[PDB]
């Protein structure tokens, strides 16, 4: 039988909302954290990998932050498994819009389109909604530098500094405290990013292997999306030591 079970996936529950959508948020809590911060001349993503292991080879240097396009970047907060499917959908959407548009993809436009797929599953199809909240960072001309946040609930948000993944309530306040509206420049912002990651992890000690840091900085005529090598992140891990003092002072 199948008629004697509950899981209230497409069916509304006594709550007025589905179980499956609310549960997805719990899975996101105990998985590696992703934050995006705003700078005056770029935007950046910093993420904690889902690997708590002490030995990584770096086969794929995108295990949390994947650069979709030469105009965009994403992070994963949640399960790496649902991310894999989503990553492939993103390389196509991000480039398709660009073929037509010939202008760096708007951060808002991308998320609302994606959020529509996240909600489609929970409402119909009898599939659960993806266990992944994707943190999009990008730049378009008519909003400026942007950060947008994606949920499994189909909720979107326009942010300037936010964090999703593990211990999110603490994390967004911590980004607000150090970094106000429009305050901090790109280089000093990369430091800030590591400082919050050190504090908030599923399992302590922040290392090069556990972190991946990505920059969107607009270069001479092109907006350049790079994922920093382990070597560069390390220079930021010492910078993050310097940053702890600096927030306090």
């Amino acid at each position: 039988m199948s008629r004697r079970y509950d899981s209230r996936t497409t069916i509304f529950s006594p709550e007025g909302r589905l179980y499956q959508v609310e549960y997805a948020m719990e899975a996101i809590g105990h998985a590696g954290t992703c934050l995006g911060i705003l700078a005056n001349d770029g935007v950046l993503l910093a993420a904690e990998r889902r690997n708590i292991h002490k030995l990584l080879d770096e086969v794929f240097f995108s295990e949390k932050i994947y650069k979709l396009n030469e105009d965009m970047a994403c992070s994963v907060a949640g399960i790496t498994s649902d991310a894999n499917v989503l990553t492939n959908e993103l390389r196509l959407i991000a480039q398709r819009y660009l073929l037509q548009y010939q202008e760096p993809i708007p951060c808002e436009q991308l998320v609302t389109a994606l959020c529509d797929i996240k909600q489609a599953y929970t409402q119909f199809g009898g599939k659960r909604p993806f266990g992944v909240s994707l943190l999009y960072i990008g730049w378009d001309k008519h909003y400026g530098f942007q950060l947008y946040q994606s949920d499994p609930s189909g909720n979107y948000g326009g942010w300037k500094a936010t964090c999703i993944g593990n211990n999110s309530a603490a994390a967004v306040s911590m980004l607000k405290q150090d970094y106000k509206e429009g305050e901090m420049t790109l280089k000093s912002a990369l430091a800030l990013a590591v400082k919050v990651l050190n504090k908030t992890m599923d399992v302590s000690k922040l290392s090069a292997e556990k972190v991946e840091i990505a920059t969107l900085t607009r270069e001479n005529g092109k907006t350049v999306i790079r994922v920093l090598k382990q070597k560069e992140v390390e220079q930021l891990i010492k910078k993050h030591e310097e940053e702890e003092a600096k927030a306090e002072r």
Partner: peptide
């Protein structure tokens, strides 16, 4: 639009559980 149970079953109230929810 794929499931394996009805979305609602009727009541003798004459309310739809899903519309009220």
């Amino acid at each position: 639009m794929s499931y394996d149970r009805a979305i609602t079953v009727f009541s003798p109230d004459g309310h739809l559980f899903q519309v009220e929810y």
